[PDB]
Curated annotation (Swiss-Prot), chain A:
Belongs to the ABC transporter superfamily. Siderophore-Fe(3+) uptake transporter (SIUT) (TC 3.A.1.21) family. Its EC number is 7.2.2.-. Its cofactor is FAD. Keywords: ATP-binding, Cell inner membrane, Cell membrane, FAD, Flavoprotein, Membrane, Nucleotide-binding, Translocase, Transmembrane, Transmembrane helix, Transport. One of its GO terms (molecular function) is oxidoreductase activity. Residues 34-54, 149-152, 262-269 are periplasmic. It is a multi-pass membrane protein. This is Mycobactin import ATP-binding/permease protein IrtA. The chain holds residues 318 to 889 of 908 of the full protein. The import function of IrtAB is contradictory to structural predictions, which suggest that it has an ABC exporter fold. Part of the ABC transporter complex IrtAB involved in the import of iron-bound mycobactin (Fe-MBT) and carboxymycobactin (Fe-cMBT). Has a preference for Fe-MBT over Fe-cMBT. Mycobactins are then reduced by the siderophore interaction domain to facilitate iron release in the bacterial cell. Transmembrane domains (TMD) form a pore in the membrane and the ATP-binding domain (NBD) is responsible for energy generation. It comes from Mycolicibacterium thermoresistibile (strain ATCC 19527 / DSM 44167 / CIP 105390 / JCM 6362 / NCTC 10409 / 316) (Mycobacterium thermoresistibile).
From Swiss-Prot, chain B:
This is Mycobactin import ATP-binding/permease protein IrtB. The chain crosses the membrane at residues 25-45, 48-68, 126-146, 147-167, 241-261, 272-292. It is found in: Cell inner membrane. The ATPase activity of IrtAB is stimulated more than 38-fold in the presence of Fe-MBT, and more than 10-fold in the presence of Fe-cMBT. One of its GO terms (cellular component) is plasma membrane. Residues 331-563 form the ABC transporter domain.
Length: 559, 563
């Protein structure tokens, strides 16, 4: 799963392995020269030899630092470039997934996936292979050297190594489950935090801070972190003590001093252990702290590739104008939970189709299926005779504009929000679209004018931001329009004026109107009553009233 | 380190003092253990190696003391890190509902989000992961230098002069990468907010065709974030080079003086060999500081965000309470004025609403009638004037009694991710099942239960996105009617309901048994049948008021409004 994602970094990661092997051998070479320098320095060698060894040792230290710095610079750039490409792939993937994926997952979990999962790959793909190769090469090279020097004092170095390995294994075993539970806990707390900040007026009125679910789950998450981190940090510092250079220096002397005091060793031969033996502990600590990073990186790779393996809205090769044509459409958000049932409905150019009915019947889903935010479970939807599943997002949305139930405004200027469908539209087109939607006057009252930003906290009134979205759809100016409960939050005077503007623009266009204000849709050429996900009756306003059906019931209740 | 001490709880300052004492003691023991080698090799290489047992016996004691204090320092560092984590997060959680509503700008909303999102393990283990190794690395070569003054005074001077360049490099490394790190943090935060917008506004972006990265706002945020990230990597190279050169300069100073003393004969030959090991122990912190310095910059940015949230201006309050045990209070605006930013929303609105009667508010769009309901509920507060509940100003009311006295049906009915019954129980979690069933019945939510497959356990999405607009609206109505508050503000509670459900909910709003002052905002004349009074809020002014039939006969703005 992870390897299929990280395959493009095959050659950087292999090159990182070999370069670290050479670099960590180069980093160990100075202390080999210093041992040679110390031995000749006790032997009273000529000053030329001492200066040559000393100067070379300092130069090789500089070379090692330069090469290590150049490596981590290059390897971090490679990781940064891969993450940008991977995030670009995820954004392109999410641009064509079914829209139920977002609804059941949430925006918080999407935030973890795009940004924090790709960031969790860091230690795996830039630090893991160097740290592992260093901990394999340098301790082996040092211990081989010291076993050549003296086996008695080289054997005691297995004591801190064995204790470190035991601590490393039990640490990873103990924290393995928690590292797997961690990403979902972060998703949950991300969800709670987003709801806490977005749903602030509900928190202020209903229960305040203490009664909020966020504080309950915040305590639960911190309790999880404490249980995860206390034994983990406890083991993590015991390893730090075991592999510290001071620990190696002490245990070397404990094993060496009783020998040297006796006639069993020459103190000249303790020099390698003091100089080489203390240095390879810090490199063991690398993977000692990095196993958790590798575990997190592998799990993040699995989540990322799982989403990149997710099924998406394909664009088939199967391959009147202005017509929309639903042909025995059926749809279910959850399998076994139908919401549309055998609906047949043809929208023709130069007509207005009013899709009314009880709340929760399925009207907004049927508008969504015309948008192809989801795929029908049965039947087909055809635009200009071309099935929407054979149309790319470009071709499909060239032909059908939308005003959605929720007035979702993106963070940006008002001209950007109106020009969302066509950012390169001239300002004069934007002002005419706003005048039609009866929102240009309010925009001129704003401080900055059209450039004023509509982020949350600098928002507009409910009816006003709805009129902005109506202005957006008018600017798109598609052959087909779908007015999913426009004028819901508008007053009767604004509602009448925007409807007049819409009825002026869309005389040679296909219009689908979803309205609970039944008095606004009496002019429709066809009034479709959608109840329980199935069309219960069809006709004009006068015909439906005379029929005494469901529409008569809704009409009478409206008085 | 000043920002951390500001965030420390006053309870935990005693542990911070103890932690600081042990951290210094640990560093002294590390340096003394390193410098005890110099006597040790002097004795071991002499003609009487039995003298080395003294220094080995002392080195062992310093080493064990190093182990014990370092485990204790880790323990105290862990407790300090989580204690700060729990207390700051609880302070932010309690403060944010009290922060002024105007504070939540898109930038401030982002900052509050990342501050809460910092609850993860990176901040919890901040003390053990960052402060403890930093203080160890920064103070170790100084402690080695002070220890080496005993072995040789000018040798200790050379060691401490190396520490001067160490702190010099540490100071300059921060300034070199400060601007790039700030830009990188800003672009990352923008990328986070655009991802959230991308996942939330997905339908509108898809229809508007701004969803592809080449065309989307999030794609531009990703490109800018990548560019800023590479700049940060490039601008960290001066810091890495500076620490490396500082390490080499300290190596030259320490080694040069050691060789000078060795050649001059004032310092022994085996001791000069021991100084190689002490020099390596002396130069290890020069690399550790380089590794830790970038984490400091990120931590400073994180704690700036946490303190910024804790610096937010809480809404004014008091300790006044209503005398009534939830009996209906009168509501009146005493010449209220209110303005978002610089635009006047309300200009001297004045009215008095009777205790038990229902009042309707109507008028053109953008008039300011949700603002009137928000002011009555205390979500906002007037710029000037005073809003009274039963003769008591709301600004002086106890925040507990202030929110307990009002229940609201919001214009946009947000719902929390969870079951349907959880969202209804938010109104009053201690309510009886009999009361909950009555509340859901009144809001026509029983129709949802007998039509949805899971019933009241139907999981709602983020917001109310897994429910129809009318369905989440009825759930909000059920939530509000459940609460026993004596003031019920109905802000377009039937905007997204069909005529049948709209009629049923409208009857239920008046059929609710307990007495309340009911303020209803509506754009449907059939939704204000039961109102005893009307207020035509236009352009921030109550242009007229009276009864429905009275205003209709008068032929004023009301008759034209419902033509
Ligand atoms: Mg809908
Ligand atoms: Mg409103
Ligand atoms: Zn890194």
């Amino acid at each position: 799963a992870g390897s299929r994602l990280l395959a493009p970094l095959k050659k950087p990661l292999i090159v990182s392995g070999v370069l670290q092997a050479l670099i960590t051998l180069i980093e160990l070479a100075p202390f080999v020269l210093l041992v040679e320098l110390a031995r000749l320095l006790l032997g009273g060698a000529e000053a030329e030899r001492l200066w040559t060894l000393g100067l070379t040792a300092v130069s090789l230290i500089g070379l090692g630092a330069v090469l290590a710095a150049a490596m981590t610079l290059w390897l971090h750039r490679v990781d940064a470039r891969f993450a940008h490409e991977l995030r670009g792939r995820l954004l392109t993937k999410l641009s064509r997934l079914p829209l139920g994926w977002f609804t059941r997952r949430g925006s918080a979990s999407t935030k973890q996936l795009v940004q924090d999962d790709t960031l969790a790959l860091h230690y795996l793909i830039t630090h893991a292979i160097p740290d592992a190769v260093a901990a394999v090469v340098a301790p082996v090279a040092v211990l081989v050297y010291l076993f050549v020097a003296d086996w008695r004092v080289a054997l005691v170095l297995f004591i801190p190594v064995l204790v470190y390995l035991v601590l490393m294994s039990v640490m990873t075993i103990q924290s393995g489950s928690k590292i797997a539970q961690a990403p979902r806990w972060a998703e949950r707390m991300g969800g709670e935090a987003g709801a806490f900040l977005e749903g602030q007026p509900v928190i202020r009125i209903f229960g305040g801070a203490a009664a909020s679910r966020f504080r309950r789950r915040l305590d639960d998450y911190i309790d999880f972190l404490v249980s995860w981190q206390r034994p983990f940090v406890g083991k993590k510092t015991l390893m730090d003590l075991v592999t510290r250079p001071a620990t190696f220096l002490w245990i070397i002397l404990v094993a060496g001093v009783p020998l040297v005091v006796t006639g069993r060793m020459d103190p000249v031969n303790l020099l390698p252990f003091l100089l080489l033996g203390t240095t390879f502990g810090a490199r063991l600590l690398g993977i000692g702290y990095g196993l958790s990073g590798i575990q997190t990186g592998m799990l993040a790779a699995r989540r990322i590739q799982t989403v990149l393996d997710e099924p998406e809205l394909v664009v088939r090769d199967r391959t009147r104008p202005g017509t929309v044509e639903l042909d025995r459409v059926s749809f279910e958000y959850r399998p076994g939970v139908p919401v549309i049932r055998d609906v047949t409905l043809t929208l023709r150019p130069g007509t207005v189709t009013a899709l009314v009915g009880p709340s929760g019947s399925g009207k907004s889903t049927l508008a969504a299926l015309v948008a192809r935010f989801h795929d029908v479970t049965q039947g087909a939807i055809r635009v200009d005779g071309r099935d929407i599943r054979t149309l790319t997002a470009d071709e499909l949305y060239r032909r059908v504009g939308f005003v959605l139930q929720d007035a979702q405004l993106v963070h940006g200027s008002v001209a950007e929000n109106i020009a969302l469908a066509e950012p390169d539209a001239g300002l004069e087109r934007i002002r005419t679209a706003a005048r039609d939607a009866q929102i240009h006057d309010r925009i001129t009252r704003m401080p900055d004018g059209y450039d004023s930003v509509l982020g949350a906290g600098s928002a507009l009134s409910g009816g006003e931001r709805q009129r902005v979205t109506i202005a957006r759809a008018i600017l798109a100016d598609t052959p087909v329009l779908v007015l999913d409960e426009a004028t819901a939050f508008a007053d009767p005077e604004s509602e009448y004026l925007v409807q007049q503007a819409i009825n002026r623009l869309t005389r040679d266009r296909t219009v689908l109107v979803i309205a609970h204000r039944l008095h606004t849709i009496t002019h429709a050429d066809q009034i479709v009553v959608l109840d329980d996900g199935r069309i219960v009756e069809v006709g004009t306003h006068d015909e439906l009233l005379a029929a005494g059906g469901r529409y008569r019931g809704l009409w009478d209740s409206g008085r | 380190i000043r920002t951390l001490l500001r965030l420390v709880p006053a309870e935990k300052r005693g542990a911070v003092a103890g932690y600081a004492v042990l951290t210094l003691l640990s560093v002294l023991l590390r340096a003394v253990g390193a410098v005890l080698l110099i006597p040790l090799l002097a004795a071991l290489f002499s003609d009487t190696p039995s003298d080395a047992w003294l220094w080995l016996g002392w080195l062992t004691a310093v080493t064990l003391a190093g182990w014990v204090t370092d485990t204790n320092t880790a323990r105290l560092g862990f407790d300090l890190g989580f204690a700060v984590l729990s207390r700051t997060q609880h302070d932010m959680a309690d403060r944010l509902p009290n922060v002024a509503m105007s504070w939540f700008t898109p930038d401030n909303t982002a900052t509050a989000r990342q501050a809460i999102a910092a609850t993860g393990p990176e901040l919890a283990g901040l003390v053990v992961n960052l402060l403890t190794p930093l203080i160890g690395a920064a103070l170790l070569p100084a402690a080695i230098g002070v220890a080496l003054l005993f072995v040789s005074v000018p040798l200790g001077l050379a060691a401490l002069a190396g520490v001067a360049v160490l702190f010099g490099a540490l100071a300059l490394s921060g300034r070199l990468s400060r601007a790039a790190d700030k830009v990188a943090g800003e672009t990352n935060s923008a990328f986070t907010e655009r991802i959230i917008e991308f996942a939330r506004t997905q339908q509108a972006l898809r229809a508007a065709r701004r969803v592809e990265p080449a065309r989307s706002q999030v794609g531009s945020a990703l490109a800018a974030q990548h560019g800023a990230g590479l700049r940060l990597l490039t601008m960290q190279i001066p810091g890495q080079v500076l620490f490396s050169l500082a390490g080499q300069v300290a190596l030259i100073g320490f080694a040069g003086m050691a060789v000078w003393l060795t050649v001059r004969g004032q310092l022994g030959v085996p001791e000069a060999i021991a100084l190689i090991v002490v020099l390596v122990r002396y130069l290890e912190p020069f690399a550790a500081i380089a590794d830790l310095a970038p984490a400091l910059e990120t931590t400073r940015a994180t704690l700036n965000r946490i303190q910024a949230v804790l610096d937010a201006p809480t809404l004014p309050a008091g300790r006044r309470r209503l005398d009534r045990t939830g009996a209906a209070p009168s509501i009146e605006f005493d010449d209220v004025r209110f303005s978002y930013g610089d635009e006047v929303v309300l200009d001297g609105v004045s009215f008095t609403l009777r205790p038990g009667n229902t009042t309707a508010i109507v008028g053109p769009s953008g008039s300011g009638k949700t603002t009137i309901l928000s002011l009555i509920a205390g979500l906002q507060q007037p710029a000037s004037g005073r809003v009274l509940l039963d003769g008591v100003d709301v600004t002086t009311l106890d925040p507990e009694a202030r929110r307990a006295a009002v229940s609201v049906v919001f214009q946009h009915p947000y719902l929390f991710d969870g079951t349907l019954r959880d969202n209804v129980l938010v109104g009053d979690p201690e309510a009886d099942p009999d009361d909950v069933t009555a509340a859901m019945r009144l809001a026509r939510v029983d129709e949802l239960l007998d039509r949805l497959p899971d019933g009241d356990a139907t999981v709602v999405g983020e917001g109310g996105t897994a429910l129809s607009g009318g369905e989440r609206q009825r759930v909000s109505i059920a939530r509000a009617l459940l609460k026993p508050a004596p003031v019920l503000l109905v802000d377009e509670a039937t905007s997204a309901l069909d005529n049948a459900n709209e009629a049923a909910v409208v009857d239920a709003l008046t059929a609710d048994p307990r007495p309340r002052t009911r303020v209803i905002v509506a754009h449907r004349l059939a939704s204000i049948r039961h109102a005893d009074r009307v207020l035509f809020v236009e352009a921030g002014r109550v242009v007229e008021d009276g009864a429905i039939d009275e205003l209709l006969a008068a032929g004023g703005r009301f008759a034209q409004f419902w033509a």
